[PDB]
Amino acid sequence: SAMDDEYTKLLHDGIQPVAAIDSNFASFTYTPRSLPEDDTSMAILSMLQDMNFINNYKIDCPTLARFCLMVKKGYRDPPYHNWMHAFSVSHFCYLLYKNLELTNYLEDIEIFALFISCMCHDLDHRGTNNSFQVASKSVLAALYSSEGSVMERHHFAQAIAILNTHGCNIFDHFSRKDYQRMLDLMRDIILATDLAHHLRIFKDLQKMAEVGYDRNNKQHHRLLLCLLMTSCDLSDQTKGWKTTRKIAELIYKEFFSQGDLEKAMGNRPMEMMDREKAYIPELQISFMEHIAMPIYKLLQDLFPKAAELYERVASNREHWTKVSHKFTIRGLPSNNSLDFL
Ligand SMILES: Cc1cc([C@@H]2CN(C(=O)c3ccc(F)c(I)c3)CC(F)(F)C2)n2ncnc2n1
Ligand SMILES: [Mg+2]
Ligand SMILES: [Zn+2]
DSSP states (O other): OHHHHHHHHHHHSOOOOGGGTOTTTTSTTOOGGGSOGGGHHHHHHHHHHHTTHHHHTTOOHHHHHHHHHHHHHTOOOOSSSSHHHHHHHHHHHHHHHHHHOGGGTSOHHHHHHHHHHHHHTTTTOOSOOHHHHHHTTOHHHHHHTTTSOHHHHHHHHHHHHHHTSTTOOTTTTSOHHHHHHHHHHHHHHHHTTSHHHHHHHHHHHHHHHHHOOOTTOHHHHHHHHHHHHHHHHTGGGGSOHHHHHHHHHHHHHHHHHHHHHHHHTTOOOOGGGOTTTOOHHHHHHHHIIIIIHHHHHHHHHHOGGGHHHHHHHHHHHHHHHHHGGGGSOOSSOTTSOOTTO
8 A cells, every 4th residue: 555655646746857856966976875765766767757768768657657666665675785775776877877978889778778777686685695595595596596696687587577567567568679678688787787797707898998899899788788787786986985984884784694694504604794704994995996996997998987986986995094993992992891802
């Protein structure tokens, strides 16, 4: 009944103009996690409208309203992999569209697929990684472990199950070829969110950047969609220091909860998931240096207007070194007690 009332307003009230969400809503400086969660579904509609996807693809408004609410309802509430993560990832896709001239690189249907994939790309996440699915013999590993990217295959399958819910197929008027194309793009883009996939294709991304993007090269389109998806997925790191500090807290809370479950199963967790061994500053610097910084450098190499994103990530990485000393206990604890020994 709650979704029904939310649906009724979303459909009949009208789509708010994107500028009424916030004055800097289309800026790389805007933090979409500042928007109250109760306003995010309308914000999704506003972005789809402002990108002209509703008109261009003649999307049925009742179907779109139901679809957006169903996607939102398809996320659980772990500390990090929740609807506010998917919303902020989608918002960054919108920022790329508004700031980087994607229509000079990608087909319209590819840009639309990227945005919809962003909304769906972590559907039904349980706060555990792919290794945990296999180690815990979960149902998801039973379905997908032979293929790899267990969680990402589940996210895609959940997106399809939403489309296959009566009243929710935003694409059901597409031609057969266009429908097939959209679902194939969603498959490739969602599976691209597995960081292991990113690391496998990284040298191909570098080679594409070095030689120059070729808009007539079908493999270049595919590689660019992967890089853009990853850039949206990691985009919290392109914001201010306070955003990245909070996101670190949410990440480690989720990771350490997984590690607690592994220890209760008799398995030694990954160091980054073991609250007794993980040293957060060192781990964030390693993640920033080896994963996040190279991604935004590739993006800057392909889009010179993305330079500010890379500089922000590098700045945040240097901030971690500046605060590292605070993880050492100087003097006595604030309670004046050594009881923790
Ligand atoms: C925006 C953002 C997203 C993520 C993670 C990265 N991921 C990892 O597997 C991972 C790999 C190597 C590492 F050294 C660490 I630490 C984590 C996957 C994910 F957990 F889904 C989200 N982190 N992690 C730290 N700061 C982040 N900021
Ligand atoms: Mg994911
Ligand atoms: Zn994600």
